[PDB]
């Protein structure tokens, strides 16, 4: 299986598998069962912004989600990512839909990682996406539309979101997030998203994640498993 | 008085005023009495590197000091800097010497701050310093030498450090580290230093600090007070 | 007098003083009489974007102005800026109005300069401006409005532009754009603007400029002189 | 065949194929026969630095090579790279040796490309290289040594350079250097190198190049052809 670290924007509460009884954002460390979660006042229909940051010294993975002119949602979890993730990784975005749906549009995405022992670094940012982006590995249904937006999950020609869909987008170049005796390593990511839906209770969510470089959509990882895990353990 | 936040590289143990009985690095929040300290295996004579980072979401000020081919020293303190510092600040470097001395040479210094509500930012970096640097506010004895290094404390023409000296260097432009309803704010700083000394027990240390924009060397802030505070409260 | 280098977005054709008989953008080197100009298809009422770049090796100052979904305007001039500008400078934005008016709103502004001999650098960017920005030197009428925009020239409470106005905004920290034996130096700047006007022929324009660090609005530098020069020589 | 743009640090004068009768750096546009060259006061044994920059507005490819405490070598060529290169490319470093040899060690390499229509970007930098770098495509003999240096051409266990060797290193992620109606696109690259040799006349050189994303070492592209072209046309 893969090794996964992620910040989930969980729109549908799957109380049966540990999820709180309300939309939320959480930090997942090798398990869909978030190590930490926080109430997310979902603004279906409005453009949101997610910011994720971490550094090997403070060892505190944090994330904040906001919408113009409205309070933000934040979540943090203390953990030394060097204990979880391998030295070389690929970073990406994933999203799913199940019985209930929603659009999982990504309008922009930037990422920066630095490894000091000087200081090697990788930084990329898309304010728009082109169809057939050669610097992205699109998995599942994920695709880029004519507007320059990244649709992680299927969206009809009418723009209507489809259920039971899954997709991911990984940056092409692997990233060296750590090495023995490195002095400090850090990474920061930001993405803007647009979740729309005709459903009274939209599902399932969007995530920013980091995994082994050969990561792929696990068998039956749809719906409540945000396309990151094979099961709910 | 000033409002000060700092990461101190305390070379001399002043046990009388809270200091541990060994060289150390610490985080000071409006008091020379560090809120958190860690043992610093001082490498007198070798070039060291300090890295300081913080973001408004994780709210954890961290710092790591290292030397080539040798373990590093780290220290962190959980605190919401928005509660301590004013919205506009100036960042700088300070250093002192008392009865016992040491050189407090700065070879390079970089700093980055971002404020998102987009994202305003300020970034500067010196790999060398020119004499009469117009983008630095030099306070006390602090000066730039012919080699392009910043000498925070007095150093004889022979290169010998002098005791009872104090100096600071602030970046010229004020920095807006926070604003109401900002989504996230962060800053990161790095500097390389060279502390040399003929003394068996060198003093007193070097700090990276953030304070009110009109900050200045407090009356009798020399020696064990690292040129940041008027007293030891 | 001051030493000035600038990229002018000249909205009003002052044919009497060398100006072409149409709105234009030009590169000015110590003279309002541009060394090079190009036809500017002014989009009064729409948000424009200006990008200015230069490096000591290619020695070619360039600038491009564009508006969404419409062709751009470009202008270049080969010149070694080390022959014109002093080693330390301040960069800024200026704008004016005369008999005829227009708003000269700046929505964002970023700047980056690098000097290698390593590589010292300065970078700042505002996606919004706060009233009473401590990292800007506002000259003349220039002010920040409640929306977070920079109004270089007077704008009535109703938003109506006023004639015979002048204003400039300089970044606070001086910039070291060059030093003897430097290997390469470069700078890049971008700003977005909004020029509105009830006039059939709006005036006078907006500029990005670089000058001596103590530069100020020259006596009677209003109107066609874009607040940069004392006369039209 | 491939589409190649490159800055060559040509250490051996192959006068028969257009080369000047002295070591030189040049800009090659789809031909080993440089469109522009300049005398290179080669400092065999000392660490050199190369800086390459270009932007779609000025349309002037430039490069400068220097060594500590000694004059630099510069070369420029006016050309709209959008006419030569395809929209998606891969950037890299290449080097060769023929009858005569030299080491072609790369100590660091950074690259930045921006495409505005906002502003997509890619930036990476290595201050050291790890063996088996997953974010580099190593071609030919190119390899990373235990010191963290990139050896483009074969170097014996004793550190002695070998003749008749060729190698290249490409960054893993493709780069989108241009798109229709883009406002401005730019790229900048820097690398430090170490060329050593026991030969009275070392060969053959090092280059930074940009080519089609599937570029590879052309058949018999060794020696004077710097591993970029199949012939000398
Ligand atoms: Mn970098
Ligand atoms: Mn951040
Ligand atoms: Mn319901
Ligand atoms: Mn910035
Ligand atoms: Mn950092
Ligand atoms: Mn002792
Ligand atoms: Mn920099
Ligand atoms: Mn640019
Ligand atoms: Mn008219
Ligand atoms: Mn970028
Ligand atoms: Mn450059
Ligand atoms: Mn010879």
UniProtKB/Swiss-Prot annotation, chains A, B, C, D:
It comes from the Eukaryota. The keyword Amino-acid biosynthesis does not apply. InterPro entries: ConA-like_dom_sf, Lectin_LegA_CS, Lectin_legB_Mn/Ca_BS, Legume_lectin_dom, Leguminous_Lectin. The beta and gamma chains are produced by partial proteolytic processing of the lectin alpha chain by an asparaginyl endopeptidase. Mixture of 60% alpha lectin and 40% of its beta and gamma proteolytic fragments. A carbohydrate binds at residues 12, 99-100, 224. D-mannose/D-glucose-binding lectin. Has anti-inflammatory activity in rats. Induces histamine release in mast cells from rat. Induces lymphocyte proliferation and IFNG production. Binds one manganese (or another transition metal) ion and one calcium ion. The metal ions are essential for the saccharide-binding and cell-agglutinating activities. Is being tested as a molluscicide with potential application in controlling schistosomiasis. The causative agent of schistosomiasis depends on freshwater snails of the genus Biomphalaria as hosts during its larval stages. This is Lectin alpha chain.
């Amino acid at each position: 299986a893969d090794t996964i670290v992620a910040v989930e924007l969980d729109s549908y509460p799957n109380t049966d598998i540990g999820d709180p009884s309300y939309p939320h954002i959480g930090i997942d460390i090798k398990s869909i069962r978030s190590k930490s979660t926080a109430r997310w006042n979902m603004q279906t229909g409005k453009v949101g912004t997610a910011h994720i940051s971490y550094n090997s010294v403070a060892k505190r993975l944090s994330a904040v989600v906001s919408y113009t002119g409205s309070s933000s949602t934040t979540v943090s979890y203390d953990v030394d990512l060097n204990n979880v993730l391998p030295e070389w990784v690929r970073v990406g975005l994933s999203a799913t839909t199940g019985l209930y749906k929603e659009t999982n549009t990504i309008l922009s995405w930037s990422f920066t990682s630095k490894l000091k022992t000087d200081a090697n670094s990788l930084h990329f940012s898309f304010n728009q996406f082109s169809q057939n982006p050669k610097d992205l590995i699109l998995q599942s249904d994920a695709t880029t539309d004519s507007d320059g937006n990244l649709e992680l999950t299927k969206v009809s020609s009418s723009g209507d979101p489809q259920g039971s869909s899954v997709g991911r987008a990984l940056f092409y170049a692997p990233v060296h997030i750590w090495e023995k005796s490195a002095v400090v390593a850090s990474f920061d990511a930001t993405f803007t998203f647009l979740i729309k839906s005709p459903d009274r209770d939209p599902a399932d969510g969007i995530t920013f994640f980091i995994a082994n470089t050969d990561t792929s959509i696990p068998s039956g990882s749809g719906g409540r498993l945000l396309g990151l895990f094979p099961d709910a353990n």
